[PDB]
Amino acid sequence: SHHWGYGKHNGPEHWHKDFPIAKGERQSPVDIDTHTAKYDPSLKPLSVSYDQATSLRILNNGHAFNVEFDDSQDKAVLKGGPLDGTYRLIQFHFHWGSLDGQGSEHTVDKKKYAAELHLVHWNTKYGDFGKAVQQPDGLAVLGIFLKVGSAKPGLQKVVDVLDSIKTKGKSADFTNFDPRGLLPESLDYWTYPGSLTTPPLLECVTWIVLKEPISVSSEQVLKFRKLNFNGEGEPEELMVDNWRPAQPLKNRQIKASFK
Ligand SMILES: CC(=O)/C(=C/c1cccs1)C(=O)Nc1ccc(S(N)(=O)=O)cc1
Ligand SMILES: [Cl-]
Numbered sequence: 188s189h190h191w192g193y194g195k196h197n198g199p200e201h202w203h204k205d206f207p208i209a210k211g212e213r214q215s216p217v218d219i220d221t222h223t224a225k226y227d228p229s230l231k232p233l234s235v236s237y238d239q240a241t242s243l244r245i246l247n248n249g250h251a252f253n254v255e256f257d258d259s260q261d262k263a264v265l266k267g268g269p270l271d272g273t274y275r276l277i278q279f280h281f282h283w284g285s286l287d288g289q290g291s292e293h294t295v296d297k298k299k300y301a302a303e304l305h306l307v308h309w310n311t312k313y314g315d316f317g318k319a320v321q322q323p324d325g326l327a328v329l330g331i332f333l334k335v336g337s338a339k340p341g342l343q344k345v346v347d348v349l350d351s352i353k354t355k356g357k358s359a360d361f362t363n364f365d366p367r368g369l370l371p372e373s374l375d376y377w378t379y380p381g382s383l384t385t386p387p388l389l390e391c392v393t394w395i396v397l398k399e400p401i402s403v404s405s406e407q408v409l410k411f412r413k414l415n416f417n418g419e420g421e422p423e424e425l426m427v428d429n430w431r432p433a434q435p436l437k438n439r440q441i442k443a444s445f446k
């Protein structure tokens with residue numbers, strides 16, 4: 188079994204030894220250079236259809252926390268933009284920092300945000316998530332930057348349950364959560380082909396990164412930083428800086444949905 192994490196001893200600089208694809212041709216995240224991303228008129232409109240989303244549970248997995256959805260039917264889907272066909276929402280999670288000047292995985296002209304939200308979707312033509320991650324177009328991850336300012340009211344139900352999943356392996360019931368409350372006003376985005384940003388680092392993701400960040404309060408992100416990487420009863424290791432740094436772009440072009 189693997190023992191990867193975000194520390195000096197097991198952090199992103201080490202991952203390549205158990206996961207050689209870490210040094211691959213389409214790794215994530217990347218720096219988005221706004222002055223070399225080109226507007227693409229071929230991109231179709233982005234369609235976020237979360238009206239029927241059914242959240243079930245929230246889990247501390249020792250790396251982040253996942254809010255899990257019922258993906259047994261097309262209840263919450265992402266379509267359009269660069270995507271062919273229908274991608275089903277399975278979970279969302281965040282990456283965040285020890286301080287407000289770091290935490291995001293993607294950067295914008297080398298700017299790091301306080302955190303980044305990932306809404307993870309799988310291509311329904313592959314029938315299940317485990318099959319989809321074996322395909323170069325298997326997943327679509329919608330990435331949203333968080334900056335510290337005004338509170339995000341639609342985030343507070345997540346903040347308030349974190350006390351109940353402090354340590355690795357803890358879960359709580361988390362029904363009737365509406366992920367539409369986490370979106371910014373604008374769906375303007377950048378898109379590029381990439382990877383999972385954690386082991387197993389599979390090159391199966393179409394990244395869609397929204398240009399407009401959402402604002403959350405200092406108090407909201409301080410509550411993320413009280414989570415633990417460790418299990419119950421173990422020495423406390425605060426769950427902070429669970430982000431992978433920007434990886435080489437190599438032979439890829441980032442496309443913008445907007446002028
Ligand atoms: C157990 C579990 O949670 C997962 C299992 C998998 C099993 C096989 C491939 S993944 C999973 O979904 N991993 C994941 C999802 C999104 C991102 S990211 N930061 O690129 O959005 C990173 C990791
Ligand atoms: Cl900004």
Ligand SMILES: [Zn+2]
Pocket residue numbers: 280281282305384
């Ligand atoms: Zn992620």
